[PDB]
Amino acid sequence: MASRILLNNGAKMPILGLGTWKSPPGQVTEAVKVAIDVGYRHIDCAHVYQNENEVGVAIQEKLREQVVKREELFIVSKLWCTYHEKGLVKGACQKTLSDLKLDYLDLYLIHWPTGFKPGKEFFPLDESGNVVPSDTNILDTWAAMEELVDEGLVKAIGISNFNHLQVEMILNKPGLKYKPAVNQIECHPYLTQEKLIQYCQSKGIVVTAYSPLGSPDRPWAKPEDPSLLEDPRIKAIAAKHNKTTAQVLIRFPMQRNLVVIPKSVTPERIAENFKVFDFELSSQDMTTLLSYNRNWRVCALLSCTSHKDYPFHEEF
């Protein structure tokens, strides 16, 4: 189990990163500092998480402390939906760079395929309760992303929450300059993503698994929803290995040649979650975890389902 995976820009990406969605500004500096200390090099960020400044402070601290150097870190951020217009993309990237306090990003993703009305509000809604879209399209937004590579702001570009047809649209774009390096998608034992993973990997696109613990802290969760972390079948596998359920849920995608980005703001759990390089799930464990798929996704909004580019109408 090598700790990094080769990307199609020639760079190497650490397979275990720290998620930062819902880590509040007042606590995330400590979280990221602890993460870097215990071995995390990959940090998953986004402008919409509204904590990039404080992630950036942790990075600056660890550089100053001589704990890491910039080139050892793999910092990912994402273009929010309200900035899909070609003319807004560079400024959005620069804002993220200013907040993270970096010269460049290792990877910059189109966060969702759906463009939203530009403006101050991140989730502009109309009187029907649906998001107000923008007059933007995947291919033009991709071209703007490509310019960021040529301008040296980012080392690689990729996508997130794109279905296979949306990926294909980019792969077949006339005059394509860069293929997506990564597609970051929800993936865990209840949403194993076998078809989309098969598709992306065959194209040399690395898949990052988000919400690997089932995002129990998501806001819009339903009392009548699942709980991976409490699934006794998964705890049974953990117990066999003298590990925790979270550790099993993190190791699982690692053994599928995926990158994985579990989130914690808690020092003890940040450290726990990185202790997954000293054991292996058996081939039976792997097959068994795959059998738990129920095609249940937690990251999707009713308010986005009428968007022309909503990704989850398609099977995969």
Ligand SMILES: NC(=O)c1ccc[n+]([C@@H]2O[C@H](COP(=O)([O-])OP(=O)(O)OC[C@H]3O[C@@H](n4cnc5c(N)ncnc54)[C@H](OP(=O)(O)O)[C@@H]3O)[C@@H](O)[C@H]2O)c1
């Ligand atoms: N591209 C996208 O559209 C997208 C969407 C969703 C997520 N993501 C990325 O993926 C990351 C991970 O997904 P996520 O934040 O949805 O959820 P997750 O990583 O599946 O779960 C995080 C939750 O699990 C808890 N937890 C973490 N480690 C634990 C442990 N060892 N034992 C018990 N509980 C533990 C955390 O609590 P504490 O923090 O309180 O310790 C938090 O409540 C995000 O932070 C974000 O970076 C991207």
Ligand SMILES: O=C(O)Cn1ccc(=O)n(Cc2ccc(Cl)c([N+](=O)[O-])c2)c1=O
């Ligand atoms: O985007 C993230 O990384 C985390 N996050 C944050 C807010 C949110 O509404 N959602 C759900 C969301 C956001 C945008 C969209 Cl465009 C959709 N959707 O269903 O199409 C869902 C999130 O997944």
